């Protein structure tokens, strides 16, 4: 995250850190005690699918404070329409091996109904994006979780002000000062409405970040609510990766 602030410990309690062989891979969002939403592209190059870990309650990566909860990732579900190394359909649903325990530091973000998200949330101007990604373009990643308030653009307005599909949206700033960045992919774009926060976007990717003339690109979660809900009602299948039809 470029140009944000430290998320005070416990104020982003749905944020997930994904690790592969102990190394930072991506962010994610907790939506229930065993389900995490992330970005499909995070998994394009995984060799050993059995060394993926999700960490909840993380804040400062330099220390252990006892609020962290680690779980193995049992399933990574990706839409059939996602093509590796691209932006369209950049979403993954992850099933944890064992539920996390909800605590003051570990709380799911609400996955909204489609109608509500389309009719109401999509018109809330500012939303929060968070992660342990780079603090600057071509810079070091953050040790403390960072958060940034970004405004959402209508797609016509994105294209004028800069292919953005109906499965994406733009949000952020075009002056290079404030953006999501490498290391933040998969993390939440969370939208507040009448006292509750909802998942509306997933940090996707682009070439570099905080680039004058360019906005951050987010997966438009409202297009996937039904797809996610059906999968969360399904039984697990052997083998970590699952490609599931979309729609």
């Amino acid at each position: 995250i470029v140009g944000g602030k430290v998320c005070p410990k416990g104020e982003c309690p749905w944020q997930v850190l994904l690790l592969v062989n102990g190394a930072q891979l991506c962010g994610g969002t907790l939506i229930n005690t065993i389900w995490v939403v992330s970005a499909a592209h995070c998994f394009d190059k995984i060799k050993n699918w059995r060394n993926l870990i999700a960490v909840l309650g993380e804040h400062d990566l330099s220390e252990h404070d006892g609020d962290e909860q680690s779980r193995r990732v049992a399933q990574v579900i990706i839409p059939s329409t996602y093509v590796p190394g691209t932006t369209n359909h950049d979403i993954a649903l992850l099933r944890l091996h064992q539920p996390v325990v909800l605590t003051d530091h570990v709380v799911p973000l609400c996955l909204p109904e489609r109608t509500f998200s389309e009719r109401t949330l999509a018109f809330v101007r500012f939303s929060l994006v968070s992660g342990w990604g780079q603090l600057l373009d071509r810079g070091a990643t953050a040790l403390e979780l960072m958060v940034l308030n970004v405004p959402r653009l209508m797609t016509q307005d994105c294209l004028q002000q800069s292919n953005i599909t109906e499965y994406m949206f733009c949000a952020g700033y075009s002056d290079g000062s404030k953006d999501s960045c490498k290391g933040d992919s998969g993390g939440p774009h969370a939208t507040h409405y009448r006292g509750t926060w909802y998942l509306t976007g997933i940090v996707s990717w682009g070439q570099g970040c905080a680039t004058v003339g360019h906005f951050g690109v987010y997966t438009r979660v409202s297009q996937y609510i039904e797809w996610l809900q059906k999968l969360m009602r399904s039984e697990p299948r052997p083998g970590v990766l699952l490609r599931a039809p979309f729609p």
């Binding site: 104020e11 973000l109 509500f116 509750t196 909802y198």
Partner: protein, 57 residues
């Protein structure tokens, strides 16, 4: 009704045939008798931040 002002619902809204509307709440919340408001029914409902909810409790 639901397309305007969220139908007055705090959370989810469904239209029915007639001048009818039903609000609903996410799991972990229940609908109050006003037919619009949602109140938590569990300790850690989705989309609420406990350390801030307790700062205002």
């Amino acid at each position: 009704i639901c397309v305007n002002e969220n139908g007055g619902c705090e959370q989810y809204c469904s239209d029915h045939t007639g001048t009818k509307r039903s609000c609903r709440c996410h799991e972990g919340y229940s609908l109050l008798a006003d037919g619009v408001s949602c109140t938590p029914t569990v300790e850690y409902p989705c989309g609420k931040i406990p350390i801030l909810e307790k700062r205002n409790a």
